[PDB]
């Protein structure tokens, strides 16, 4: 089965670093230079054994063909209104990128407004962020090449879809907010740096600045509106209040749901925007989140987590700003997380709640906060929404494990609010009635009850004979809610598989206390929760260890790699996508420094003591028992992943192959694939998505010897 040889990789035994008295060896530190011939040669040699391995079986061809078949369905974003026109994104099915469409009315003929597919031969130029002017006559949009986080902002006149000269460079992790006078737009950019800025470099991103761009001018003329040279990790995003009177500045440092909130009354500017604005520091600490919902004069509605881990709505009067004077509009729920809030039709609020990892959507009165209407949904997620203050209607998109989904429309001018199906798609060949979704709660090591979704064919015998695909993330206050995945459904239908998603701690499923439960010193809880999910699926007879595949991306890549090190006996197969593997060095590269609010930083002795215990790169260890080897492992990354620098995976696979792959008891493959012209994942063209999922389940099929079920 292993009809190849692992490439010889040079070990730099001199690369020894002292971490607070602990000596750490990093023999593959030279892989940190992406541009070197050594690194390029290493990548080439690895791809040379992985690709033939993945493609040897006709099962990949059968999966890709079926994936291409079943993924070929119409995909719509919500309709949204800007000015006198409606806009929406649409994919016929297999287009590399969705296309932005425009129509002059809800019943009128639609035409192409922005087609990103024509900007690249392989669909690797993607839209990343956009902002319409207040009156909807002008358009700003970000473009990213080859999956990099770097953005170029370009501009369009909407009427006639006319290209404008304005180009903004060095844009990354940026806001986009037009002042309501249409004169220009707020955005973020980074100062010039040495070396490259295309997404292949590893250079840390610091000193992000807020600029204002006056339309019709050169970027060189752009106004500097906020900077934090004493605080190089600070990031300030700007937005305009609904009335267009205030610029609100949300300043973040790290990834915790917290921000400073400064404001600038634009009326109070002496001569318009000409320099650093007269910021009024309403909230000048990082002790809570303050997310603008709406305002009425000086009374501002914010979604907050201040003393409310499940989130709530407060009113802050700018003329009476003390916390003691704040009014609680919609108090915190006992258990339900308030996911997001939008203001529509002047005085309505749309609240989205997460109840036991499922969405409910509600309409509330702005003045009192009182519940008015529940929008009836099935069990699943709200993944799209449209409806701002001046709008008199809402669009919202629903999805779930077995349903491609539905877009609903509701006219809010009507006395009795009737929401109707505006758009619906059904994937032919996938009979949703053949399958069921159950939610269970399994006890973790410490007795905590963890939610897990299980999707399987109806009527299966729980005798532990089915192959299983267990997914997890666990971090950064992210909630892994039900979603439609054709790729995972083919695994169920055509590979006889059971699919599982565990809502482990670190996520935001049960608020900030759930987040805190799997970060910093408590990070090990994530791995404990995920391992317990695996054991539950085994004990209940959904699967066996030799038939179980675990999967996660980025922070979830860290998850499955750590679980591989800690419990190799528990899994047959592990797929780690774009994973953070070097927990000691992660903070040094690109935006990695922002993740220390979840992980900690090896600069501190306390944090280093946490990190060394689970860091995938530093815990590759031959299993003590003779009957136990490492699971089959496939790492997936790409050369323009500047979110999680690919060196993470490169050093990890080298370590796996040397320490474990060399041993004679190891027959399970340990492989990496490094893609070109792709990045972390956002904006990845359909074609590449199909290639990836085909590789993944071809890896599973080969390593577990799974027959295709046509």
């Amino acid at each position: 089965m292993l009809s190849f040889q692992y490439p010889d990789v040079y070990r730099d035994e001199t690369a020894i670093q002292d971490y607070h008295g602990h000596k750490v060896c990093d023999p593959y530190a030279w892989l940190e230079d992406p541009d070197s011939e050594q690194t390029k040669a290493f990548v080439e040699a690895q791809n040379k054994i992985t690709v033939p391995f993945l493609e040897q079986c006709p099962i990949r061809g059968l999966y890709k063909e079926r994936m291409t078949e079943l993924y070929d369905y119409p995909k719509y974003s919500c309709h949204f209104k800007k000015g006198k026109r409606y806009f929406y994104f649409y994919n016929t099915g297999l287009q590399n990128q969705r296309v932005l469409y425009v129509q002059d009315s809800l019943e009128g003929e639609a035409r192409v407004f922005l087609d990103p597919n024509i900007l690249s031969d392989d669909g690797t130029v993607a839209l990343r962020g956009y902002a319409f002017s207040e009156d909807g006559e002008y358009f700003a949009y970000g473009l990213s090449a080859s999956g990099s986080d770097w953005v170029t902002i370009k501009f369009m006149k909407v009427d006639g879809a006319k290209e404008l000269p304005d180009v903004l460079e060095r844009v990354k992790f940026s806001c986009m907010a037009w002042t309501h006078d249409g004169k220009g737009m707020f955005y973020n950019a980074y100062p010039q740096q040495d070396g490259k800025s295309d997404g292949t470099e590893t250079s840390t991103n610091l000193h992000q600045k807020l600029y204002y761009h006056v339309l019709g001018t050169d970027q060189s003329e752009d106004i500097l509106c906020a900077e934090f040279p004493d605080e190089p990790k600070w990031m300030g995003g700007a937005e305009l209040s609904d009335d267009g009177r205030y610029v609100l500045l949300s300043i973040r440092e790290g990834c915790d749901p917290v921000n400073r909130l400064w404001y600038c009354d634009l009326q109070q500017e002496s001569n318009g925007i000409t320099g650093i604005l007269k910021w009024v520091k309403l909230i000048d600490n990082f002790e809570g989140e303050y997310d603008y919902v709406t305002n009425e004069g000086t009374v501002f509605t914010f979604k907050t987590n201040r003393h409310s881990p499940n989130y709530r709505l407060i009113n802050i009067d700018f003329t009476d700003p003390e916390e003691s004077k704040w009014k609680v509009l919609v108090p915190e729920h006992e258990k339900d997380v308030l996911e997001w809030v939008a203001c529509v039709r002047s005085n309505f609020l749309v609240l989205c709640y997460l109840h036991d990892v499922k969405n409910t959507l509600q309409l509330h009165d702005l003045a009192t906060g009182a519940l008015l209407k529940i929008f009836p949904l099935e069990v699943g997620s709200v993944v799209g929404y449209s409806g701002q203050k001046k709008d008199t209607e809402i669009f919202y998109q629903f999805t779930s494990f077995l349903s491609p989904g539905i877009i609903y429309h509701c006219d809010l001018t009507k006395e009795e609010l009737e929401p109707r199906v505006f758009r619906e798609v059904t994937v032919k060949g996938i009979d949703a009635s053949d399958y069921q979704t159950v939610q269970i709660f399994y006890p973790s090591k410490d007795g905590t009850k963890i939610p897990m979704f299980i999707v399987h064919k109806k009527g299966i015998k729980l005798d532990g004979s089915h192959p299983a695909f267990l997914y997890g993330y666990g971090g950064f206050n992210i909630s892994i809610t039900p979603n439609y995945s054709v790729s995972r459904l083919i695994f169920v239908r055509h590979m006889g598989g059971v699919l599982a998603v565990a809502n482990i701690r670190g996520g935001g499923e049960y608020g900030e206390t759930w987040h805190k439960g799997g970060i910093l010193a408590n990070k090990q809880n994530c791995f404990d929760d995920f391992q317990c999910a695996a054991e539950y699926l085994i004990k209940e007879g959904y699967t066996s260890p030799k038939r179980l595949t675990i999967n996660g991306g980025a922070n979830g890549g860290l998850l499955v790699a750590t679980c591989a090190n800690q419990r190799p006996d528990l899994f047959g197969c592990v797929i780690a996508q774009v994973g953070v593997m070097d927990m000691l060095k992660f903070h040094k590269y690109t935006i990695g420094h922002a993740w220390t609010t979840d992980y900690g930083c090896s600069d501190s002795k306390q944090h280093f003591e946490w990190l060394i215990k689970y860091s995938p790169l530093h815990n590759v260890k031959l299993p003590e028992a003779d009957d136990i080897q490492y699971p089959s492992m496939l790492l997936l990354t790409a050369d323009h992943d500047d979110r999680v620098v690919p060196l993470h995976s490169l050093k990890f696979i080298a370590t796996l192959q040397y320490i474990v792959g060399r041993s004679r008891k190891q027959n399970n493959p340990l492989l990496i694939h490094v893609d070109t012209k792709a990045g972390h994942g956002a904006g990845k063209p359909t074609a590449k998505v199909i290639e990836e999922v085909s590789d993944m389940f071809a890896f599973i099929a080969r390593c577990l010897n799974i027959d295709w079920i046509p």
Partner: peptide, 4 residues
Amino acid sequence: GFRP
């Protein structure tokens, strides 16, 4: 959005 700059989370991993």
